[PDB]
Subunit: 339 residues, 2 copies
C-alpha cells in the first residue's frame, strides 16, 4: 500500500508498505528516507516533520551532493581549471556547500509495480549553483519491494563538464531508539583498507592504510564496541568511526557490508568503490529523535560513494562528469530477520 | 476557508475562499497564482495540474526572477564588475535564466488572519545560480482578503552585492475563456511614455518615447482593440503589446491601471515604476487552457517591476541589491464590480 500525506512546509511524506507489512517512508524535501519500520520498531533515525530536519539536522536520510563529503579548500580542477565551490565548513566544501540539494523540495512521481514501488525524485541544479558547472539534471529513485529491499538509483546528465558523487545519508540504529548506542551491533565489512584523516578538520591525511588485523578490520563480523574502545589514533581522533573504507571487491552482487542486532540484519550492496562510515560521534549534543535524546554513537551511516579526498589521492578515483555523459549509481539496503 | 491538496509532481494547490465567496488559488510550484474565480468564472488564465505548466507554459501566474524580462547578452555590472548570466533566449538572459525560480517547488507557510489569509512562499537562490551572486534568501507572500484584494509582497536579502527585480506573471482574461480575445476589454493606464524595442530579439531600443495621443495612450479608458488594430511600428513589431509602460505618478496609493469588461474591473496598484504589458501575441500557437485553444491576444499581463533595459537606459532605474540590504516590493490586484459603465460590443 502507498500513502501520501503532508509532511510540513509544503513537503510530502510518501509511505510504502509492502506485502510483509514493513513500512518505509520518504520525503521530497531532500529526496530522503524518513523512517523504516518492522513490527513497530524504527530501524533508522528520523524526525516527525519537515521543520525538524531544517531546525535540527538536515542531513539524516538525505540525498547529499552534488559531491558527498569534504573537499579541501572548496577546490576542484575541471578540465585543467580550478574552481572554488561554496565553502561551508571552514574552507571546506562539505556535502555540496550550503543550502545544498538536501534542503530543496524535489519533484517526484510514484510508480506502482506491484511487488515493487518506485518513487522518482527530480531536481535541476542550475549551472553555477554553489560554484558547480551545470546545469545538472538529477534524479534519485528510491524503491521498496516485497523482499524488503530498499534500493537507491541515481542518475545525472550535465550540460558541462563538472563533478558528481552523491550519497544517501541514512543513519541506522537497530535499537530503534536514539538514546541507545549502536556499540551493541555487530558489523561485517569487506574492506581491508581505509583513508585516514589528517586532523580534526577531517580532510584526508594523504595516504591509504592497511587495516588488516587492527581494531578496524570488520572483515569478520565483529561488535562495534571493539572499534569503539580502540586506542588507534584514528579512532581516538574522531571519537569513533568517520572514515572511508575501500571495498576489496567491486560489484553490486557482493554483500559489501552487514549490520546485525539479534535476529535483525541489514545487508549493504553497492556499485560504488567505497563506504564512508560515521558513527554519530556527537558527544553530548543530544539531538532529539522522537522525543529521545540522542547519544554519542546513537547511529551509524553507510555512505556509498567514491571516497572523499580524490583531489589529493587520485588513486581513490575520479569524480568528474563529462558534459553529456550519463551518471548512474546504485546502492541497496536489504532487511532480513532470522526465523 | 483554506483548502490544500496535492496538485501534481509533488506540488500543492492552496485554495482560499473569502467571505464574499470569491475563490483564489496558488501553487508552490513557482510561487504562482493558478486561478481566481468570481461566480464560477475564471478572471485569469491557468492550467489544471502542475504538469501542464511544465509541459505547456511554465510562466503563467508565476513569480519570475531574480530579474524579470530580458538582459541584453546576459551582461550586468555589479559593483564595477561585469557578470554574465545564464543565456536562455539566444544571447539574452530572459526571466533569470533557464530552469529559473518559476520552475522550482518553494516551501510555504499559511497564516490565517481571519479577514486576510497569507501564503508565504520561500526559496533560496544559491550563490552563482545561473550566474547571479548570492545566496539570495527570497520570499513571496500572496494574500487575499475580504475586500477582494490580491496582494503580492516580495522580500529578499543577499549575502553578496547582486541584482534583483522580480515580477508576477499572471495573465488576465475577463472573458473567462482563453479562446476569447481581450480586445473587448477596456484599459485605463496612468502612463505617458513607453520603452520601444530594438527589434524581434526584444531588447530595448535605447530611447523612451511619449505615446500621448497615439493608439498606445490609455490614460483615458479605451478598448484594447485600438492598440491591436494599430499599425504603429512597435505594435506591428510584436504583433500586439509587449512593452514597458513608465508610470507617470509613483506610489502604492494610486490606481495605475484598470482593466474592465462589463461589470467587472481589476485595478492594479504597485510600488514599482513600470508595468510591462504583454498581450499574449502567440498567433496560432493555440495553447489549451481548460480545453479551450488560446487565441492570439487571449490574455494580458501587468508585470509590475523596474523596466527591463536599465542596463542600457540607466534612467529606468537601478536593480542592484547590496549585500545585507532588504529588498521589498508590493503589487496589488483588486477586484471590483460595477465600478463603471462598460457596455460595448465587438
Ligand atoms: O563529522 C564527521 C562526519 O560528518 C558528516 O556530515 C558526514 O556525512 C560523515 O560521513 C562524517 O565525515
Ligand atoms: O514575448 C515578449 C513577452 O515575453 C514573455 O512572455 C514576457 O514574460 C512578457 O512580458 C513579454 O515581454
Ligand atoms: Na503536498
Amino acid at each position: 500500500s502507498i500513502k501520501i500525506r503532508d509532511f510540513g512546509l509544503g513537503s510530502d511524506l510518501i509511505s510504502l508498505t509492502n506485502k510483509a507489512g514493513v513500512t518505509i517512508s520518504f520525503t521530497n524535501l531532500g529526496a530522503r528516507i524518513v523512517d523504516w519500520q518492522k513490527d513497530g520498531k524504527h530501524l533508522i533515525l528520523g524526525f516527525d516533520s519537515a521543520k525538524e530536519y531544517l531546525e535540527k539536522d538536515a542531513y539524516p536520510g538525505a540525498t547529499v551532493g552534488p559531491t558527498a563529503g569534504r573537499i579541501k579548500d572548496g577546490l576542484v580542477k575541471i578540465s585543467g581549471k580550478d574552481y572554488i565551490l561554496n565553502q561551508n565548513e571552514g574552507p571546506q566544501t562539505l556535502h555540496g556547500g550550503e543550502e545544498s540539494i538536501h534542503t530543496k523540495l524535489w519533484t517526484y512521481e510514484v510508480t506502482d509495480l506491484g511487488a515493487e514501488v518506485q518513487v522518482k525524485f527530480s531536481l535541476v541544479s542550475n549551472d553555477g549553483t554553489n560554484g558547480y558547472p551545470g546545469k545538472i539534471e538529477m534524479s534519485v529513485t528510491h524503491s521498496f519491494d516485497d523482499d524488503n529491499k530498499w534500493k537507491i538509483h541515481y542518475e545525472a546528465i550535465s550540460d558541462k563538464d563538472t563533478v558528481f558523487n552523491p550519497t544517501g545519508h541514512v543513519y541506522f540504529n537497530l535499537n530503534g531508539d536514539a538514546s541507545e548506542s549502536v556499540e551493541n551491533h555487530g558489523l561485517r565489512l569487506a574492506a581491508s583498507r581505509f583513508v585516514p584523516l589528517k586532523d580534526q578538520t577531517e580532510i584526508v591525511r594523504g595516504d591509504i592504510v592497511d587495516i588488516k588485523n587492527t581494531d578496524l578490520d570488520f572483515r569478520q563480523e565483529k561488535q562495534l564496541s571493539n572499534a569503539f574502545n580502540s586506542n588507534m589514533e584514528q579512532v581516538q581522533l574522531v571519537k569513533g568511526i568517520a572514515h572511508p573504507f575501500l571495498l576489496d571487491q567491486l560489484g553490486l552482487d557482493k554483500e559489501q557490508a552487514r549490520l546485525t542486532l539479534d535476529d535483525t540484519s541489514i545487508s549493504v550492496f553497492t556499485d560504488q568503490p567505497s563506504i564512508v562510515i560515521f558513527t554519530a560521534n556527537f558527544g553530548d549534543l543530544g539531538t532529539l529523535y522522537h522525543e529521545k535524546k540522542q547519544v554519542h554513537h546513537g547511529g551509524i551511516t553507510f555512505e556509498c560513494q567514491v571516497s572523499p579526498g580524490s583531489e589529493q589521492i587520485p588513486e581513490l578515483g575520479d569524480i568528474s562528469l563529462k558534459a553529456g555523459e550519463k551518471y548512474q549509481a546504485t546502492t541497496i539496503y536489504s532487511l532480513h530477520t532470522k526465523l
